[PDB]
Amino acid sequence: MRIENCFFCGRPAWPSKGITFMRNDGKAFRFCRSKCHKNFKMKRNPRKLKWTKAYRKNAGKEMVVDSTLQFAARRNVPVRYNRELWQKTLKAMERISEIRARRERVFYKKRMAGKRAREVAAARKLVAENEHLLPRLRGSEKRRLAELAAERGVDVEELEREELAKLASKKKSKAFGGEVRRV
Amino acid sequence: VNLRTQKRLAASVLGCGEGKVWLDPNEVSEISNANSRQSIRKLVADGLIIKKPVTMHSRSRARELNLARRIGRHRGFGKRKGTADARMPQQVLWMRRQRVLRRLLVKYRASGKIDKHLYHELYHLAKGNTFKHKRALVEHIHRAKAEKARERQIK
């Protein structure tokens, strides 16, 4: 047996999975699932459906140029069976898989490099426009810190900073409404 | 505590529907003590009874759709549902065109550009559907003037 691939989306097609369409010109179309089969019957383009490997290649979101992608091919010239060749092939398959995985991760990071700079710029703009929503001590808490600093001879700004630390550590959500007392 | 009479009286006093009357839920005994329209008016002045505002029906989407249709959107064959005559009548178009042409002919005869015989035959051509619009009538008057001037210069 062998593992085929879906014509429409590109997923691995295993035995008894999906359905094959035989056309009168002599071409056969293997689909992994009824989703791909029904989209094909609705004449949707796989290149425009964003969940397909066709779209991902056309958008450049899959690693398409690599040395590790040259090892798998449809071999139309058979090789006489050789036990040593098959075992070294299996070892090659493992090593190729590992190398391909690391190179794919590098490719994804090179796609996603600029995110940190964009997010930092957006955060700076948001903070600059909304400085007034930053956490703040209560007026009663400020007065109590001021009188405690006057009593203990300590720094009111210092007391304010550890109180900001405490109210930053303690997160309390507010509830809607409230019970009405019965008569 | 039943407040049906108070709700009806407050609707009559405030000049609104009973669904626009607000009775204070924390003042139900004091509202229940109000059996007369004078007492209901006093509670309205105190603010225990208020008239709720109207529910929104905005015209903003209608106005944007009107501007879009004015500049030409949503006028395609998929948008049309009535016939061309049901949408714009040919009789209305013809009446407007005839009034425009007759107004122009009266203006030209009054100003003296054309004389009375030329006015008469142009009136009957306009009734016989020679000119489709004002520019067509104006160009016909100009070519007739050119022919008359050429005949006068020849004679």
Binding site: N5, P46, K57, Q70, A73, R74, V77 | -
Partner: protein, 101 residues
């Protein structure tokens, strides 16, 4: 509007595909095979007025030149300009290939 939209996706209502349309445009033998698959006397307008892009027969030259101004023909032109989806593009999408020696 689409005639009998409920049973549009049945196999007995199936239309010609865009890759077959590309093959018909590039090679006249493929189009000739498709036309020999049909009977000329039962065709609209005796088969004389045919749009290869829409893969469709028309009753008259006026009707054919008429549909060419419409948007279905223009969407077919746009899809042909983009290119039909085929097995070699499907194979390149997964990075697979054929070794023929």
């Amino acid at each position: 509007g689409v005639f009998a939209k409920r049973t549009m996706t049945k196999t007995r209502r199936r239309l010609r595909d865009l890759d077959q349309i590309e093959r018909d445009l590039r090679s006249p033998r493929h189009l000739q095979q498709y036309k020999e698959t049909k009977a000329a006397e039962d065709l609209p307008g005796l088969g004389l007025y045919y749009c290869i892009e829409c893969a469709k027969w028309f009753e008259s030259e006026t009707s054919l030149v008429g549909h060419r101004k419409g948007k279905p023909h223009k969407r077919r032109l746009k899809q042909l300009k983009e290119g039909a989806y085929t097995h070699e593009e499907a194979m390149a999408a997964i990075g697979y290939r054929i070794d023929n020696g």
